[PDB]
Design a protein around this ligand. Sequence first.
Ligand SMILES: *[C@@H]1O[C@H](CO)[C@@H](O[C@@H]2O[C@H](CO)[C@@H](O)[C@H](O)[C@H]2NC(C)=O)[C@H](O)[C@H]1NC(C)=O
Lengths: 49, 48
Amino acid sequence: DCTMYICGDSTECSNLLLQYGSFCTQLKRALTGIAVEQDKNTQEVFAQV
Amino acid sequence: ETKCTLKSFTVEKGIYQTSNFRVQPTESIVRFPNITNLCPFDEVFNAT
Ligand SMILES: *[C@@H]1O[C@H](CO)[C@@H](O[C@@H]2O[C@H](CO)[C@@H](O)[C@H](O)[C@H]2NC(C)=O)[C@H](O)[C@H]1NC(C)=O
């Protein structure tokens, strides 16, 4: 989670972080692709019958 | 919540994630309850 790691429990970074815009919402899409793809690898090794 | 997280009015079938869960604070607190060692000013200001 981008919010808690960088400026958790903070009401001053909350508005400030939006000044950078679309950084930490880009990172989630990168890692979510890896996690989803991980299950596919196991599918291609055992689900052949 | 997931509509505005994805910045769209439509969502497709699947599992998504949103703003993380957190319990907000309620009250405010302070410290240093015992204070001692007052400076001796009375004899300066009230000597006979
Ligand atoms: C001075 O500091 C001491 C250290 O804790 C205080 O001692 C206790 O304080 C609590 C909460 O204030 C009281 O419930 C206890 O009864 C205190 N102990 C004793 C033996 O009385 C003390 O209260 C402080 N002084 C003042 C004036 O608050």
